[PDB]
Short mmCIF file of N, CA, C and O in Angstrom, two decimals:
data_model
loop_
_atom_site.label_atom_id
_atom_site.label_comp_id
_atom_site.label_asym_id
_atom_site.label_seq_id
_atom_site.Cartn_x
_atom_site.Cartn_y
_atom_site.Cartn_z
N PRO B 1 -94.82 -55.07 -4.33
CA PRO B 1 -95.80 -56.27 -4.27
C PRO B 1 -95.55 -56.72 -2.99
O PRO B 1 -94.58 -57.45 -2.56
N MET B 2 -96.49 -56.28 -1.91
CA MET B 2 -96.09 -56.80 -0.65
C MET B 2 -96.31 -58.27 -0.42
O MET B 2 -96.06 -58.88 0.55
N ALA B 3 -96.84 -58.86 -1.49
CA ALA B 3 -97.14 -60.30 -1.50
C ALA B 3 -95.68 -61.06 -1.19
O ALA B 3 -95.53 -61.99 -0.35
N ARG B 4 -94.52 -60.79 -2.00
CA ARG B 4 -93.27 -61.08 -1.61
C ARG B 4 -93.04 -60.96 -0.12
O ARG B 4 -92.30 -62.03 0.36
N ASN B 5 -93.40 -60.12 0.64
CA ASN B 5 -93.18 -60.02 1.79
C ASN B 5 -94.10 -60.75 2.73
O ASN B 5 -93.76 -61.46 3.77
N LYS B 6 -95.34 -60.68 2.34
CA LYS B 6 -96.49 -61.45 2.83
C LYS B 6 -96.08 -62.99 2.98
O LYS B 6 -96.31 -63.63 3.81
N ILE B 7 -95.64 -63.31 1.62
CA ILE B 7 -95.34 -64.88 1.61
C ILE B 7 -93.96 -65.36 2.33
O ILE B 7 -94.03 -66.14 3.19
N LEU B 8 -93.17 -64.32 2.29
CA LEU B 8 -91.69 -64.56 3.16
C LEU B 8 -92.26 -64.49 4.67
O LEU B 8 -91.93 -65.10 5.46
N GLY B 9 -93.07 -63.26 4.91
CA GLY B 9 -93.29 -63.22 6.46
C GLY B 9 -94.03 -64.43 6.89
O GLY B 9 -93.98 -64.77 7.96
N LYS B 10 -94.84 -64.91 6.18
CA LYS B 10 -95.38 -66.44 6.41
C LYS B 10 -94.40 -67.21 7.00
O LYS B 10 -94.63 -68.15 8.01
N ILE B 11 -93.31 -67.36 6.35
CA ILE B 11 -92.34 -68.26 6.74
C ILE B 11 -91.45 -68.01 7.98
O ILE B 11 -91.04 -68.80 8.61
N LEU B 12 -91.54 -66.54 8.34
CA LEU B 12 -90.89 -66.23 9.41
C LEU B 12 -91.48 -66.88 10.65
O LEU B 12 -90.71 -67.27 11.57
N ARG B 13 -92.67 -67.09 10.98
CA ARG B 13 -93.19 -67.72 12.25
C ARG B 13 -92.63 -69.08 12.17
O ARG B 13 -92.19 -69.62 13.23
N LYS B 14 -92.72 -69.76 11.14
CA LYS B 14 -92.11 -71.01 10.87
C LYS B 14 -90.61 -71.11 11.22
O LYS B 14 -90.29 -72.08 12.31
N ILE B 15 -89.97 -70.08 10.88
CA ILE B 15 -88.44 -70.03 11.22
C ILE B 15 -88.48 -69.58 12.74
O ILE B 15 -87.66 -70.36 13.41
N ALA B 16 -89.24 -68.74 13.15
CA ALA B 16 -89.12 -68.29 14.70
C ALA B 16 -89.45 -69.47 15.45
O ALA B 16 -88.92 -69.48 16.53
N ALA B 17 -90.54 -70.18 15.19
CA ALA B 17 -90.84 -71.30 15.83
C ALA B 17 -89.85 -72.40 15.70
O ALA B 17 -89.68 -73.10 16.69
N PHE B 18 -89.27 -72.54 14.62
CA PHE B 18 -88.11 -73.50 14.42
C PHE B 18 -86.96 -72.95 15.22
O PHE B 18 -86.44 -73.71 15.92
N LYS B 19 -86.62 -71.76 15.12
CA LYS B 19 -85.34 -71.19 15.85
C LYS B 19 -85.74 -71.12 17.50
O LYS B 19 -85.09 -70.73 18.31
#
């Protein structure tokens, strides 16, 4: 279920932007 990665991947930009 790529969704798990898709939803998580969505958070990455937030984290990347945050970090």
